[PDB]
Amino acid sequence: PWSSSEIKDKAGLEALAKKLNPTVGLWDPLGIAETSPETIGWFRHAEIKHGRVAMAAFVGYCVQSNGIHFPWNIQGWQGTPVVSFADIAAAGGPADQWDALSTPAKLQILGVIGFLEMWSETSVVLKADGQEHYVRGGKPGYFPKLSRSDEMAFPHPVPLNLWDPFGFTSKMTPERKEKALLAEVNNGRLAMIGIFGMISA
């Protein structure tokens, strides 16, 4: 059973809809607001995560198309062939650059991404922190801290966290955080349509 103020009904979805945009309101033709609280939370977090990934992908696409490559060597230290980020850039456009990336580099990147995914999904970590799983009444999008000294801390200390490593939010006001969440949802949708547009082009 849900025990939080997280949205669990079409009324709350409509409230958040007018909050993010008074004009559109709730645009739900498929009627996936007519679902259980757990599914509503799942859809909320899915939207948020697509926003994160789409924004990151769009900014990466812009930087890679501009051609601001890295100055290092990507391989060739532990007795392997030498490949440079300049070579990766000269491979082609962003999809071609990803294709030109070596296979274990891809595997390690995807592994770190999955590590962050599971640190998000781990209910015990959120409850050691101040949250629960987004399906069972948790805030959609909260990343638990990777730096900690609790029993749920890594064997070796981690320096910083994923979100807010140096407190750029610092103390944003108790509701301007929600304002930024609204702006984030809108910008995530915009970046979603944008990145699919660039990929289609």
Binding site: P29, L30, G31, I32, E34
Partner: protein
């Protein structure tokens, strides 16, 4: 609707014609139901035939003009200059089956008394509004756009306007069946309908009612 109400309704449809029932089908008990049931069934049959005939008149014109969408591949690939019947017969068999099976589901939904009773209506024979297609609230997944009036232009209409509209529906469908069947007859036996002879109803050499 009782038979007195049927005579009344015929008078509203046309004050001059009245209750022209040369076969007296209204005075009958089909499958041993009541006379009110027979009236409801005949009313639904007339409304449904008029509806399908009105849509079929529009479809026959639209096909005869070779008006096809600018986004579809099937129609654009299909041969042009065909009659509407030839066009339907050369449509893919899977497409025909999807059309007929969706029509089957719509018929099942219309007949389903559970859905009508959840919406405050009944089956037409058992006493209810003939021609009322229920909404899609009871569906397993929540679709948008109920069939009748999907965008909601008649939500605020008045009962008198709606009664006038139902009378118009019956009469306009009555001549719509005649029009569509005129097209089919002229594509079949030539000279059946004189007036269309100039426009060149595209000849068809098959029995339409044999898929």
């Amino acid at each position: 609707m009782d038979k007195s109400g049927l005579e009344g309704f015929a008078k509203e449809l046309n004050p001059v014609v009245g209750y022209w029932d040369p076969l007296n089908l209204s005075n009958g008990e089909f499958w041993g139901d009541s006379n009110s049931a027979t009236i409801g069934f005949l009313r639904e049959s007339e409304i449904k035939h008029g509806r399908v005939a009105m849509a079929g008149f529009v479809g026959y014109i639209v096909h005869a003009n070779d008006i096809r969408f600018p986004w579809d591949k099937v129609a654009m690939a299909a041969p042009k200059g065909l009659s509407p019947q030839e066009l339907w017969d050369v449509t893919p068999e899977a497409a025909k089956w999807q059309i007929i099976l969706t029509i089957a589901f719509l018929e099942f939904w219309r007949e389903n008394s559970y859905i009508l009773s959840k919406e405050g209506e009944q089956h037409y024979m058992r006493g209810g509004k003939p021609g009322y297609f229920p909404t899609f609230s009871e569906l397993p997944h929540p679709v948008p756009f109920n069939l009748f009036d999907p965008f909601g232009f008649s939500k605020n209409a008045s009962p008198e306007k709606k009664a006038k509209g139902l009378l118009a529906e019956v009469n306009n469908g009555r001549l719509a069946m005649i029009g569509l069947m005129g097209f089919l007859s002229e594509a079949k036996v030539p000279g059946s309908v004189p007036a269309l002879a100039n426009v060149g109803i595209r000849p068809y050499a098959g029995e339409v009612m044999a898929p």
